[PDB]
Structure formats: structure tokens, C-alpha cells
Design a protein around this ligand. Structure first.
Ligand SMILES: CCN(CC)C1CCN(Cc2cc(C#CCOc3ccccc3)cc(I)c2O)CC1
Ligand SMILES: [Zn+2]
Length: 196
């Protein structure tokens, strides 16, 4: 089955936010609002903001999952390729098969769904650091979009869900991802293709 990707702010007014990192050739992570698409280098830090209008209950969690964007591929589980799943770049918590990791959160949990076989990573939803207006999660993507035997050039979406302590839906947002060598150039290219 295919998880829903419908944007849903829910009772707490949940939505994501992204930094404005620009498109210099050296940039390692950059988000395009026009494309709703994050471009990032392999295994590099991707800051994703969580914004709410009101405080969700203690025990609320935030889950990330990848799916293929194209209709003809949506039913296939997104996983790391046969090379990367074996490169022993473990952080001690993430299964080596999982495309999406949360970086630097000891409370991260990784799920292999018993029915759909899909992978996800979930962390507690926490209030912002003192002085801040939103909470930031740092994600890593552990294969290139081009990895043979993995994503194999097929575009993916990351779905972020706000969940209660039982796993029930409280909110949902999503964005496309391209993991590539030169996120700055690729964002510029794709934005120009869109303008054309
Ligand atoms: C005054 C401005 N107004 C927005 C208009 C508020 C700003 C303050 N924020 C608080 C806030 C809580 C949370 C959370 C949580 C669950 O854990 C809890 C742990 C302990 C206690 C409660 C919850 C996540 C986020 I992201 C977040 O912004 C809520 C919105
Ligand atoms: Zn790979």
C-alpha cells in the first residue's frame, strides 16, 4: 500500500520550514520552495524545521518516511542500494538498509513495518530551545538518487507525520528530495526548467 501524502495541518497547525541556503556550487543542502524540493549531498546534515500554532501533548512524535513520487513506482519500498546497505557506515542506531536517518538524537527509533515493509525513523516532538520559535530535526539521506539497484534515478518524497503516542495521525507535510553531488547547480537547473 501507499502511505498518504496529503498535507494536513491538524489541530496543532503543524507544518515544516526550511532554511534559505542559496544555490552556490559549494552548498550541501538547499531547499526550493518553487519545486517543494530539497536538494542535498549524500549523508550530509539536512535541517528541517517543525512549526506549530499550539503545543501538542507530551508524547507526540515526528516520523519521516520516503516513497517514490511517480505513480508507477509508488508501491515499491524505498531502501538503500546493494552497495550502501553494506558499507558499514552505521551510527549504532540506524539499520544499514534505511535511507533516512535522524542525526544526533539518541531517542530516534527506526521501524521496519511488519505489513508494508516500509522503513521510517521517528523521534519525540520537543518544544524549541530557549530563544527559538521552532524545533529543528537534522536528517541524513544515505544514498544518491542515482544509486543503481536503489532509487535508480527515480524521484522520492519524504513524508513527515506528527503522531500521538499510539501512532495516530495529528498532522502531515511532505517534500520531494534529490540526493546529488551538486545540490546548488541542480536546484538552479530544475528551477530554470520550471520557469521555462
Ligand atoms: C507563542 C507562539 N506559539 C505559536 C504561535 C507557540 C510557541 C511555542 N510552541 C511550543 C512548541 C511545543 C512543541 C512540543 C511538544 C511536545 O512535548 C511537550 C513537552 C513538554 C510540555 C509540552 C509538550 C513543539 C513545538 I515546534 C513548539 O513550538 C507552541 C506554539
Ligand atoms: Zn546507494
Amino acid at each position: 500500500s501507499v502511505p498518504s501524502q496529503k498535507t494536513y495541518q491538524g489541530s496543532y497547525g503543524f507544518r515544516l520550514g526550511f532554511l534559505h541556503s542559496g544555490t552556490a556550487k559549494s552548498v550541501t543542502c538547499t531547499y526550493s520552495p518553487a519545486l517543494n524540493k530539497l536538494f542535498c549531498q549524500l549523508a550530509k546534515t539536512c535541517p528541517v524545521q517543525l512549526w506549530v500554532d499550539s503545543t501538542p501533548p507530551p508524547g507526540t512524535r515526528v516520523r519521516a518516511m520516503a516513497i517514490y513520487k511517480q505513480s508507477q513506482h509508488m508501491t515499491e519500498v524505498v531502501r538503500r542500494c546493494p552497495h550502501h546497505e553494506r558499507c558499514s557506515d552505521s551510527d549504532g542506531l540506524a539499520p544499514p538498509q534505511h535511507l533516512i536517518r535522524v542525526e544526533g538524537n539518541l531517542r530516534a527509533e527506526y521501524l521496519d513495518d511488519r505489513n508494508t515493509f516500509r522503513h521510517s525513523v521517528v523521534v519525540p516532538c520537543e518544544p524549541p530551545e530557549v530563544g527559538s520559535d521552532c524545533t529543528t530535526i537534522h536528517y541524513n539521506y544515505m544514498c544518491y538518487s542515482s544509486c543503481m539497484g536503489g532509487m535508480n534515478r527515480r524521484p522520492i518524497l519524504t513524508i513527515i507525520t506528527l503522531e500521538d503516542s499510539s501512532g495516530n495521525l495529528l498532522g502531515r507535510d511532505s517534500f520531494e528530495v534529490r540526493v546529488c553531488a551538486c545540490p546548488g547547480r541542480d536546484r538552479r537547473t530544475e528551477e530554470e526548467n520550471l520557469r521555462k
